[PDB]
Amino acid sequence: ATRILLLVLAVIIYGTAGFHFIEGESWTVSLYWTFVTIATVGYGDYSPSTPLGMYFTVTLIVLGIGTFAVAVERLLEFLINREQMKLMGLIDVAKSRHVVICGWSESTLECLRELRGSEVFVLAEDENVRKKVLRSGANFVHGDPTRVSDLEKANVRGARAVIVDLESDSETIHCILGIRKIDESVRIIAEAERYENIEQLRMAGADQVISPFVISGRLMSRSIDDGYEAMFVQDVLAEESTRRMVEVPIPEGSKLEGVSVLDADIHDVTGVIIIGVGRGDELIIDPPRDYSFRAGDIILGIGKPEEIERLKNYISA
Amino acid sequence: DLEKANVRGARAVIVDLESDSETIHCILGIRKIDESVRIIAEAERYENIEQLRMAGADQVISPFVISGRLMSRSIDDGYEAMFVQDVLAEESTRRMVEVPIPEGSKLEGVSVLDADIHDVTGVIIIGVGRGDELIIDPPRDYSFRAGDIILGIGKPEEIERLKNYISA
Amino acid sequence: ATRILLLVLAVIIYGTAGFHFIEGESWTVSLYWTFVTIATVGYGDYSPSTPLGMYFTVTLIVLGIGTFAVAVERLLEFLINREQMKLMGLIDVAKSRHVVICGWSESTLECLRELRGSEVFVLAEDENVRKKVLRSGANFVHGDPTRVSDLEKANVRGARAVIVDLESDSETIHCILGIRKIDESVRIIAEAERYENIEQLRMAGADQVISPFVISGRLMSRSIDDGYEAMFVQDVLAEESTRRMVEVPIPEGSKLEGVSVLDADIHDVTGVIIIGVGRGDELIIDPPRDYSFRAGDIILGIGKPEEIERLKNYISA
Amino acid sequence: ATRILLLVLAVIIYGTAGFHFIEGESWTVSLYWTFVTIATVGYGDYSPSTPLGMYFTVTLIVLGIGTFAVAVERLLEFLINREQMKLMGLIDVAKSRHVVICGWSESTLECLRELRGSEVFVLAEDENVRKKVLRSGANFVHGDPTRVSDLEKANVRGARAVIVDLESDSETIHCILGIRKIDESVRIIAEAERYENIEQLRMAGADQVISPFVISGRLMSRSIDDGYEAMFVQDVLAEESTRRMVEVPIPEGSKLEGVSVLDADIHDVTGVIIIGVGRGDELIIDPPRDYSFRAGDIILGIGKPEEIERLKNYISA
Amino acid sequence: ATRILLLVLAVIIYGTAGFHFIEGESWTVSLYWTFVTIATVGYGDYSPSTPLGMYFTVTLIVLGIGTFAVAVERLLEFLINREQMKLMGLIDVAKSRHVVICGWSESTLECLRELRGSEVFVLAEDENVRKKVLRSGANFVHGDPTRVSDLEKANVRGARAVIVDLESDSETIHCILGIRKIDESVRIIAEAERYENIEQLRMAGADQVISPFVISGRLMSRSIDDGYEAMFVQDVLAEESTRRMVEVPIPEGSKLEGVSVLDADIHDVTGVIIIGVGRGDELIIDPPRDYSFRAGDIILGIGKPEEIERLKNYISA
Ligand SMILES: [Cd+2]
Ligand SMILES: [Cd+2]
Ligand SMILES: [Cd+2]
Ligand SMILES: [Cd+2]
Ligand SMILES: [Cd+2]
Ligand SMILES: [Cd+2]
Ligand SMILES: [Cd+2]
Ligand SMILES: [Cd+2]
Ligand SMILES: [Cd+2]
Ligand SMILES: [K+]
Ligand SMILES: [K+]
Ligand SMILES: [K+]
Ligand SMILES: [K+]
Ligand SMILES: [K+]
């Protein structure tokens, strides 16, 4: 690593000393001649005439190819080893606004199609997950997501959000409890499996808990007869065939700060069913009549994509 | 082996198998046996919601697509996932209700504007569905018939005020 | 990648500028001297005499070995990474008349001995299949053949034919349904396992369905007593011991267009049992007497290899 | 390996011979010119004028790039092969004061946080253990720890201590019996699992036998009612919350050699409960009143970390 | 591969043509100057003065580094790919007096300690066998030993002997039947497991059949009472504690050709119990009195290692 820098400095001290005291040349000439000889440039303006001096140069040339054969084998030992550790995980994340995904399933593959590629780091331990992650454009970190020593290789202290979706609810609770020991302020989004563990995923410290098997178990048992609410959930939340659930923010200015929901009358102007308003980490589903809008709010509503355009200009100034 | 389970002449068949390959292949086998039975499948990937309908499923439920889109939308804001979690999964305050219109009960022939449902009951009328077709956001030029189903979101104190409002 | 091109252009701007304004040499000389110095050629016709100029050249030489050490480590990071992704699958097919084989069994190994090597791409996911495919002379693409995102890495839109032979009939139906979503006109040849799924492999969109376990199950149960039809199937279709089933085309001209099968009388002239005629994606097994031949037909028949030579000249003009 | 040294010596004999007998130059000039030509230095003071001599140099130059293309491919065949064997185990330990760990579990991961990294070699055979060992900073040797031919690749004859912790007690007894066949004087620390095998691990030759499942099984069954001894074991031996079990040595001089334990009176001076004294591979738990201290003893005691400082100065001169 | 040879020949045609027709130099000078410029030697006796000629050389120099960057990336694509196929099996045996070992167990590990290392090729398919074979000094060929297409990668047609020891007796019979289809004259040594398959291993074509579980099953059931024949088998055949079973050949001359076994009287002279004589692929255990020795025979006997020395000089002339 740095023994190469000494040996390169050794042959400049062997060579310069040899040239100056045999040819009688200057110190600035003896430095200049050694640097065009080790580098195999060789202008030939200051060649050595004496047969002792001709035997000196041969020694310097073999030490020229000598140190260019120790520096090459140290570079190629560095590059084959670094591209092997980088390939099979085994590397430390250095980024600072990335998204870490603990575990890998279909629900995390579906959230890679709405995120960037090089921003996402998948921390898993299986060997088949490594080839699925590299095909999808994310980066693979090899580690146990429940072990706190391996949650720091993924750099979850300087991350934008962490997404936990593991094989059990035992590992999901234990991965949330380990992230909250490192960084108490990072955003954790977690997937529950059983209905009994939605409360234990929140007490462990998840900010958003999503339970897909409990939603899908209710829609299965309520579609045996008619299935009208399963058509609503599938066309608005899953496929977005004709409707879409949007959240739009109210900016500064915004032409409506202060009026009630009755005087604003967003539905009959626009055509968007207003569900609720997002006043700062709470959700008021069906706000009452005398709710007055503020700045920085977020309006959640269902509407056609040609009606959201009629809304996003209605609230902008 | 699907005839040992007697899928011919049943209320519904619910298919949820270990892969999407076996969920499609099970629906193609039920349609060999009974063409008219109700099949409720579960899609795992997004690309197979259309292949499960062409195979013959009457209702496809894709939970990994709903959960996948709510994960990539809750990195910043997370107000959409709060609504889904509290009316579809947990039903903590509000829940989705479907109530049918009985025969000769205060609503046969009235328009939606003077039905006045959101102001006398408090329930958010999401849509009305008649005959396996959901009319989300019914317009003011719409009338109620006996047999329609009102799909709404409301509190348990408000849902029972609706079910008395739709009675004779 | 392209930061190397800037840094190479940087030292030509550092060097040329240094040479011209110290030695007083021309602009075309200062460009020529820098290119024989970075490349370590060094003719020595335009060497720098001044001791400031001799200290300049040393700086240029270290920047010569500097950029030849960043360009080498970027090439070797490119080559070790590219030969590692190419080795374990993980690469995109770019060809346009290739044959894609989804899955791998003995029936697909038997159709590699009648095809080329570099024309065939095997799309599978197992790790033991990768070493069997590389031994046989085909190319391995790592992917799930049922996933439509991995059927496009194998480039099945610009393929000659696709051959589906997977572990279940569940995966074979689901791989056919995924190819027909990409390209509706490509040719799909599929292998059925159970008799109940021959009709579902055709409705999913396979052009040719082969059911080997249904042929082999009928020959087993009809050889307990005598086994005369199992000798016919084995010597004509499997081994080709003395007979062979051929299809010969009728070309343009062809000396027989228009005559009936009775007047042509192919059997007693040649010795080939005529099974049927291939008039354009249909097969008329045992055509009647007043069937008249056309051009572009295909004649299917069983005969000895010294009787097919007596046939292929009988229909050629 | 050494055929390269002959071929390099071949072209110096081809070249020198060619230069001397065509140009008529000296023997010391013909040696000097060949070494600045193969190395591509090329001063150009002794260039060859004759058109036969110009055709000679071209041959020497192609043999210059010839042997620099066999020496590079032999180096790169050496480096890719050596970094592949070193990566997956497959290498011989050459150190002489290292610590060998046979097997890998949580109890050996906990003794890596109190040891160095490059001093520790983990000898195992699993493929998942290799990635856990490389993450922790130790070195992985691939081998069966029960096989005596693979205990010598880990160099357990010149080791500081060996730590055996394997999957069974069958393998732990068989690994101890194999180390004692190689080096009878090395220190073996072994982990027992069942209570019946503590005596067979000592007769096989372990110097220290630790049985964690027998300690943990007694504390579980004696904590159903009150659990006061399980609080002592957890706060002194496991966590070191407020107390710690230390061993301090008595040096030469030491101001106390010769006095009894009653006259020294270590507890009421310091505050450390004296358990026992380590007189040379024996432990006298609760020594009697007329035990006289010597030099080179070791005092085992429990105390707060602000009381061990009051002890380590009390016994030092 | 050979497109590099064209491109190297391209720039000699670009360069020579450029030099001759601008500088007006000779054809033998223009060839000589291009070869000292592409190779970066650059004597500088024939430098180009004209500013058009100085712009020509720069183009030739970039094409010099151009083709030395396509030749390096083709060499390094060749070496990383060849050392990867050679590492994981995947290579063809080219030797002609080697020993092929189909399968791998303890009985084949015990016959590697009496054979050479580079003479032995182990043909197996498991991934853990590859690391055990590389540790022992043999070479690993990846293949199925029952498949005849993979028995030819191991080159069993030009082998000294083949040793079959597989996981079943089903695979051992099927590997012998496949070797005898390739080379009918090669020597096959096979290991049986059940007593019923010793006859099927000989009819399939093994030259020597060894059945270790049938020998060990008889010695177990005949050592319950006394165990005197199990001491004989263990000390002569397995350990060679004090006795050894040797075969010595009778050479030409040999001082004893023609005499009977009674007149030769080998036991009371030497001390070696004579078991039998090996007259040409047969074994006469306890030859009768009037058996006369010949040349080229082989004498099988049990004796101490200080009695075999008294025998090997008694039969030599
Ligand atoms: Cd999950
Ligand atoms: Cd959504
Ligand atoms: Cd499913
Ligand atoms: Cd099959
Ligand atoms: Cd055929
Ligand atoms: Cd243990
Ligand atoms: Cd302790
Ligand atoms: Cd065996
Ligand atoms: Cd023996
Ligand atoms: K030069
Ligand atoms: K020169
Ligand atoms: K050079
Ligand atoms: K040069
Ligand atoms: K290189």
mmCIF file of C-alpha atoms in Angstrom, chain D residues 45-289:
data_model
loop_
_atom_site.group_PDB
_atom_site.id
_atom_site.type_symbol
_atom_site.label_atom_id
_atom_site.label_comp_id
_atom_site.label_asym_id
_atom_site.label_seq_id
_atom_site.Cartn_x
_atom_site.Cartn_y
_atom_site.Cartn_z
ATOM 1 C CA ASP D 45 22.894 6.975 -29.117
ATOM 2 C CA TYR D 46 23.680 3.541 -30.602
ATOM 3 C CA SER D 47 21.039 3.095 -33.271
ATOM 4 C CA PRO D 48 21.695 0.635 -36.124
ATOM 5 C CA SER D 49 22.404 2.231 -39.536
ATOM 6 C CA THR D 50 22.603 -0.860 -41.807
ATOM 7 C CA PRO D 51 19.420 -2.113 -43.496
ATOM 8 C CA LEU D 52 20.246 -5.610 -42.292
ATOM 9 C CA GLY D 53 20.639 -4.120 -38.820
ATOM 10 C CA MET D 54 17.331 -2.289 -39.108
ATOM 11 C CA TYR D 55 15.645 -5.586 -39.938
ATOM 12 C CA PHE D 56 17.335 -7.136 -36.906
ATOM 13 C CA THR D 57 15.912 -4.621 -34.425
ATOM 14 C CA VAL D 58 12.349 -5.241 -35.591
ATOM 15 C CA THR D 59 12.764 -8.924 -34.731
ATOM 16 C CA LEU D 60 14.144 -7.959 -31.319
ATOM 17 C CA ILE D 61 11.230 -5.600 -30.701
ATOM 18 C CA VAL D 62 8.602 -8.260 -31.467
ATOM 19 C CA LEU D 63 10.480 -10.594 -29.140
ATOM 20 C CA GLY D 64 10.392 -7.729 -26.646
ATOM 21 C CA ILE D 65 6.607 -7.526 -26.780
ATOM 22 C CA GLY D 66 6.553 -11.319 -27.043
ATOM 23 C CA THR D 67 8.134 -12.034 -23.670
ATOM 24 C CA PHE D 68 6.289 -9.122 -22.064
ATOM 25 C CA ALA D 69 3.090 -10.894 -23.148
ATOM 26 C CA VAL D 70 4.057 -14.284 -21.708
ATOM 27 C CA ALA D 71 5.250 -12.725 -18.446
ATOM 28 C CA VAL D 72 2.026 -10.748 -18.050
ATOM 29 C CA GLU D 73 -0.224 -13.742 -18.695
ATOM 30 C CA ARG D 74 1.776 -15.805 -16.209
ATOM 31 C CA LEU D 75 1.488 -13.095 -13.558
ATOM 32 C CA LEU D 76 -2.235 -12.687 -14.130
ATOM 33 C CA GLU D 77 -2.742 -16.445 -14.087
ATOM 34 C CA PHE D 78 -0.909 -16.417 -10.757
ATOM 35 C CA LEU D 79 -2.898 -13.554 -9.249
ATOM 36 C CA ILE D 80 -6.411 -14.607 -10.261
ATOM 37 C CA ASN D 81 -5.722 -18.124 -9.019
ATOM 38 C CA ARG D 82 -4.169 -16.986 -5.743
ATOM 39 C CA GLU D 83 -6.942 -14.531 -4.917
ATOM 40 C CA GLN D 84 -9.533 -17.230 -5.640
ATOM 41 C CA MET D 85 -7.998 -19.839 -3.346
ATOM 42 C CA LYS D 86 -7.457 -17.227 -0.630
ATOM 43 C CA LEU D 87 -11.084 -16.110 -0.908
ATOM 44 C CA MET D 88 -12.836 -19.448 -0.355
ATOM 45 C CA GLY D 89 -10.604 -20.721 2.444
ATOM 46 C CA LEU D 90 -8.188 -23.142 0.770
ATOM 47 C CA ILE D 91 -4.985 -21.611 2.158
ATOM 48 C CA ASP D 92 -2.358 -22.562 4.734
ATOM 49 C CA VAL D 93 -1.855 -20.614 7.938
ATOM 50 C CA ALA D 94 1.764 -19.537 8.357
ATOM 51 C CA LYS D 95 1.551 -17.531 11.600
ATOM 52 C CA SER D 96 3.043 -18.678 14.883
ATOM 53 C CA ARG D 97 1.222 -17.056 17.805
ATOM 54 C CA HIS D 98 -2.330 -17.100 16.444
ATOM 55 C CA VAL D 99 -5.592 -18.366 17.953
ATOM 56 C CA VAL D 100 -7.482 -21.107 16.097
ATOM 57 C CA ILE D 101 -11.254 -21.385 16.556
ATOM 58 C CA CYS D 102 -12.721 -24.738 15.515
ATOM 59 C CA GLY D 103 -16.394 -24.185 14.776
ATOM 60 C CA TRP D 104 -18.498 -21.056 14.950
ATOM 61 C CA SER D 105 -21.421 -20.076 17.154
ATOM 62 C CA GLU D 106 -22.536 -17.190 19.323
ATOM 63 C CA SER D 107 -20.097 -18.120 22.079
ATOM 64 C CA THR D 108 -17.153 -17.756 19.700
ATOM 65 C CA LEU D 109 -18.528 -14.533 18.248
ATOM 66 C CA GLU D 110 -18.569 -13.170 21.795
ATOM 67 C CA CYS D 111 -14.893 -14.011 22.289
ATOM 68 C CA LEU D 112 -13.910 -12.131 19.134
ATOM 69 C CA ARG D 113 -14.962 -8.841 20.699
ATOM 70 C CA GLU D 114 -12.195 -9.301 23.284
ATOM 71 C CA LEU D 115 -9.484 -10.506 20.868
ATOM 72 C CA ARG D 116 -7.685 -9.117 17.843
ATOM 73 C CA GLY D 117 -8.819 -9.703 14.288
ATOM 74 C CA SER D 118 -5.791 -10.845 12.293
ATOM 75 C CA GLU D 119 -4.636 -13.066 15.168
ATOM 76 C CA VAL D 120 -7.737 -15.294 14.891
ATOM 77 C CA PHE D 121 -8.263 -18.075 12.334
ATOM 78 C CA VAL D 122 -11.645 -19.803 12.123
ATOM 79 C CA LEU D 123 -11.483 -23.361 10.789
ATOM 80 C CA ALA D 124 -14.883 -24.467 9.529
ATOM 81 C CA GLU D 125 -16.466 -26.101 6.509
ATOM 82 C CA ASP D 126 -19.879 -24.478 5.978
ATOM 83 C CA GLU D 127 -20.404 -21.880 3.260
ATOM 84 C CA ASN D 128 -22.514 -19.481 5.319
ATOM 85 C CA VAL D 129 -19.911 -19.407 8.101
ATOM 86 C CA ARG D 130 -17.412 -18.011 5.578
ATOM 87 C CA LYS D 131 -19.386 -14.811 5.104
ATOM 88 C CA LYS D 132 -19.991 -14.401 8.840
ATOM 89 C CA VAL D 133 -16.279 -14.803 9.573
ATOM 90 C CA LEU D 134 -15.171 -12.288 6.925
ATOM 91 C CA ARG D 135 -17.634 -9.713 8.289
ATOM 92 C CA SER D 136 -16.189 -10.030 11.794
ATOM 93 C CA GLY D 137 -12.539 -9.459 10.902
ATOM 94 C CA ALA D 138 -11.081 -12.947 11.332
ATOM 95 C CA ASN D 139 -9.608 -15.253 8.693
ATOM 96 C CA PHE D 140 -11.370 -18.302 7.277
ATOM 97 C CA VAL D 141 -9.634 -21.648 6.739
ATOM 98 C CA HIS D 142 -11.713 -24.235 4.915
ATOM 99 C CA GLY D 143 -11.439 -27.615 6.548
ATOM 100 C CA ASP D 144 -12.981 -30.281 8.692
ATOM 101 C CA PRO D 145 -11.908 -29.606 12.293
ATOM 102 C CA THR D 146 -12.196 -33.294 13.213
ATOM 103 C CA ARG D 147 -9.810 -34.382 10.443
ATOM 104 C CA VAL D 148 -6.167 -34.288 11.554
ATOM 105 C CA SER D 149 -5.013 -33.491 8.021
ATOM 106 C CA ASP D 150 -7.064 -30.273 8.146
ATOM 107 C CA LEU D 151 -6.019 -29.319 11.668
ATOM 108 C CA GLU D 152 -2.493 -28.944 10.289
ATOM 109 C CA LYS D 153 -3.532 -26.491 7.589
ATOM 110 C CA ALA D 154 -4.673 -24.268 10.460
ATOM 111 C CA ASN D 155 -1.219 -24.750 12.062
ATOM 112 C CA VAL D 156 -2.402 -25.797 15.524
ATOM 113 C CA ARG D 157 1.116 -26.934 16.406
ATOM 114 C CA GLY D 158 2.381 -23.368 16.560
ATOM 115 C CA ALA D 159 -0.731 -21.766 18.016
ATOM 116 C CA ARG D 160 -1.305 -19.798 21.186
ATOM 117 C CA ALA D 161 -4.564 -21.523 22.123
ATOM 118 C CA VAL D 162 -7.256 -23.524 20.343
ATOM 119 C CA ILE D 163 -10.949 -22.927 21.056
ATOM 120 C CA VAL D 164 -13.222 -25.857 20.205
ATOM 121 C CA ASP D 165 -16.955 -25.213 19.939
ATOM 122 C CA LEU D 166 -18.616 -27.583 17.482
ATOM 123 C CA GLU D 167 -22.131 -28.732 16.684
ATOM 124 C CA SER D 168 -22.150 -31.892 18.804
ATOM 125 C CA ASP D 169 -20.296 -33.208 21.778
ATOM 126 C CA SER D 170 -19.262 -36.013 19.457
ATOM 127 C CA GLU D 171 -17.291 -33.605 17.295
ATOM 128 C CA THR D 172 -15.897 -31.703 20.274
ATOM 129 C CA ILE D 173 -14.421 -34.869 21.794
ATOM 130 C CA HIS D 174 -13.105 -35.935 18.395
ATOM 131 C CA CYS D 175 -11.517 -32.544 17.717
ATOM 132 C CA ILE D 176 -9.785 -32.496 21.114
ATOM 133 C CA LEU D 177 -8.469 -36.021 20.536
ATOM 134 C CA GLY D 178 -7.027 -34.871 17.220
ATOM 135 C CA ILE D 179 -5.323 -31.742 18.528
ATOM 136 C CA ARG D 180 -3.713 -33.728 21.342
ATOM 137 C CA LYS D 181 -2.273 -36.090 18.729
ATOM 138 C CA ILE D 182 -0.497 -33.159 17.039
ATOM 139 C CA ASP D 183 0.652 -30.946 19.928
ATOM 140 C CA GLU D 184 0.375 -32.178 23.496
ATOM 141 C CA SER D 185 1.340 -28.819 25.029
ATOM 142 C CA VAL D 186 -1.057 -26.388 23.294
ATOM 143 C CA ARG D 187 -3.911 -24.911 25.327
ATOM 144 C CA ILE D 188 -7.389 -26.220 24.469
ATOM 145 C CA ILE D 189 -10.557 -24.481 25.674
ATOM 146 C CA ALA D 190 -13.706 -26.452 24.996
ATOM 147 C CA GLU D 191 -17.452 -26.050 25.351
ATOM 148 C CA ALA D 192 -19.564 -28.910 26.676
ATOM 149 C CA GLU D 193 -23.284 -29.269 26.078
ATOM 150 C CA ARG D 194 -24.543 -32.166 28.190
ATOM 151 C CA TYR D 195 -23.557 -32.734 31.794
ATOM 152 C CA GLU D 196 -22.441 -36.309 31.104
ATOM 153 C CA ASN D 197 -19.711 -35.139 28.701
ATOM 154 C CA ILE D 198 -17.851 -32.772 31.006
ATOM 155 C CA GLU D 199 -15.722 -35.676 32.193
ATOM 156 C CA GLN D 200 -15.089 -37.001 28.681
ATOM 157 C CA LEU D 201 -13.925 -33.588 27.508
ATOM 158 C CA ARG D 202 -11.304 -33.553 30.266
ATOM 159 C CA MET D 203 -10.070 -37.101 29.723
ATOM 160 C CA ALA D 204 -9.707 -36.307 26.027
ATOM 161 C CA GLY D 205 -7.385 -33.477 26.994
ATOM 162 C CA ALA D 206 -9.091 -30.101 27.278
ATOM 163 C CA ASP D 207 -7.438 -27.686 29.672
ATOM 164 C CA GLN D 208 -10.560 -25.618 30.339
ATOM 165 C CA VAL D 209 -14.085 -26.987 29.927
ATOM 166 C CA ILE D 210 -16.995 -24.534 29.961
ATOM 167 C CA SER D 211 -20.564 -25.846 30.171
ATOM 168 C CA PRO D 212 -23.033 -23.018 29.471
ATOM 169 C CA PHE D 213 -26.210 -25.085 29.160
ATOM 170 C CA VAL D 214 -25.642 -26.644 32.579
ATOM 171 C CA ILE D 215 -25.170 -23.254 34.245
ATOM 172 C CA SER D 216 -28.223 -21.882 32.436
ATOM 173 C CA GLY D 217 -30.303 -24.931 33.284
ATOM 174 C CA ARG D 218 -29.649 -24.550 36.998
ATOM 175 C CA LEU D 219 -30.435 -20.829 37.037
ATOM 176 C CA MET D 220 -33.721 -21.410 35.210
ATOM 177 C CA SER D 221 -34.981 -23.975 37.709
ATOM 178 C CA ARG D 222 -33.852 -21.899 40.702
ATOM 179 C CA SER D 223 -35.519 -18.663 39.584
ATOM 180 C CA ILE D 224 -39.116 -19.912 39.520
ATOM 181 C CA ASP D 225 -39.627 -18.677 43.084
ATOM 182 C CA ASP D 226 -37.217 -15.808 43.825
ATOM 183 C CA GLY D 227 -34.223 -15.684 41.480
ATOM 184 C CA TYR D 228 -31.557 -14.084 43.660
ATOM 185 C CA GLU D 229 -28.595 -16.125 42.464
ATOM 186 C CA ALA D 230 -29.519 -15.520 38.842
ATOM 187 C CA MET D 231 -29.245 -11.785 39.495
ATOM 188 C CA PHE D 232 -25.744 -12.288 40.898
ATOM 189 C CA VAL D 233 -24.563 -14.337 37.912
ATOM 190 C CA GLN D 234 -26.045 -11.926 35.384
ATOM 191 C CA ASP D 235 -24.673 -8.702 36.872
ATOM 192 C CA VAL D 236 -21.158 -9.983 37.652
ATOM 193 C CA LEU D 237 -20.378 -12.476 34.889
ATOM 194 C CA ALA D 238 -22.553 -11.445 31.927
ATOM 195 C CA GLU D 239 -23.330 -7.728 31.911
ATOM 196 C CA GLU D 240 -20.861 -6.249 34.443
ATOM 197 C CA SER D 241 -23.392 -3.604 35.403
ATOM 198 C CA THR D 242 -21.841 -2.512 38.691
ATOM 199 C CA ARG D 243 -19.467 -5.321 39.777
ATOM 200 C CA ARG D 244 -16.789 -7.303 37.987
ATOM 201 C CA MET D 245 -14.792 -10.460 38.620
ATOM 202 C CA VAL D 246 -11.087 -9.703 38.247
ATOM 203 C CA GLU D 247 -7.828 -11.572 38.607
ATOM 204 C CA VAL D 248 -4.835 -9.419 39.586
ATOM 205 C CA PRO D 249 -1.278 -10.787 39.798
ATOM 206 C CA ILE D 250 1.166 -10.270 42.644
ATOM 207 C CA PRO D 251 4.412 -8.955 41.110
ATOM 208 C CA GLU D 252 8.010 -9.136 42.295
ATOM 209 C CA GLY D 253 8.635 -6.984 45.333
ATOM 210 C CA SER D 254 4.957 -6.181 45.820
ATOM 211 C CA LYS D 255 5.184 -4.989 49.486
ATOM 212 C CA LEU D 256 3.104 -7.925 50.784
ATOM 213 C CA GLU D 257 5.071 -11.143 50.087
ATOM 214 C CA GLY D 258 5.047 -13.240 53.248
ATOM 215 C CA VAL D 259 2.133 -11.881 55.286
ATOM 216 C CA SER D 260 -0.981 -13.899 56.031
ATOM 217 C CA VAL D 261 -4.421 -13.118 54.646
ATOM 218 C CA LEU D 262 -5.510 -11.969 58.105
ATOM 219 C CA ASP D 263 -2.713 -9.434 58.520
ATOM 220 C CA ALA D 264 -3.042 -8.197 54.930
ATOM 221 C CA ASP D 265 -6.843 -7.833 55.378
ATOM 222 C CA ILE D 266 -7.700 -7.065 51.789
ATOM 223 C CA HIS D 267 -11.477 -6.674 52.122
ATOM 224 C CA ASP D 268 -11.825 -3.980 54.785
ATOM 225 C CA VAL D 269 -8.962 -1.953 53.310
ATOM 226 C CA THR D 270 -10.202 -2.131 49.722
ATOM 227 C CA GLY D 271 -13.776 -3.374 49.414
ATOM 228 C CA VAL D 272 -13.124 -6.381 47.191
ATOM 229 C CA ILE D 273 -14.545 -9.746 48.245
ATOM 230 C CA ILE D 274 -11.597 -12.121 47.934
ATOM 231 C CA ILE D 275 -12.707 -15.432 46.445
ATOM 232 C CA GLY D 276 -9.448 -17.309 46.054
ATOM 233 C CA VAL D 277 -5.764 -17.348 45.190
ATOM 234 C CA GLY D 278 -4.262 -18.867 42.047
ATOM 235 C CA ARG D 279 -1.108 -20.704 43.157
ATOM 236 C CA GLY D 280 0.013 -22.316 39.922
ATOM 237 C CA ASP D 281 -2.808 -24.181 38.090
ATOM 238 C CA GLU D 282 -4.898 -24.660 41.207
ATOM 239 C CA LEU D 283 -7.539 -22.531 42.888
ATOM 240 C CA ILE D 284 -7.920 -22.295 46.656
ATOM 241 C CA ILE D 285 -11.434 -20.910 47.018
ATOM 242 C CA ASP D 286 -11.690 -19.270 50.485
ATOM 243 C CA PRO D 287 -8.075 -19.733 51.605
ATOM 244 C CA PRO D 288 -7.676 -20.312 55.361
ATOM 245 C CA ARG D 289 -6.343 -17.748 57.825
#
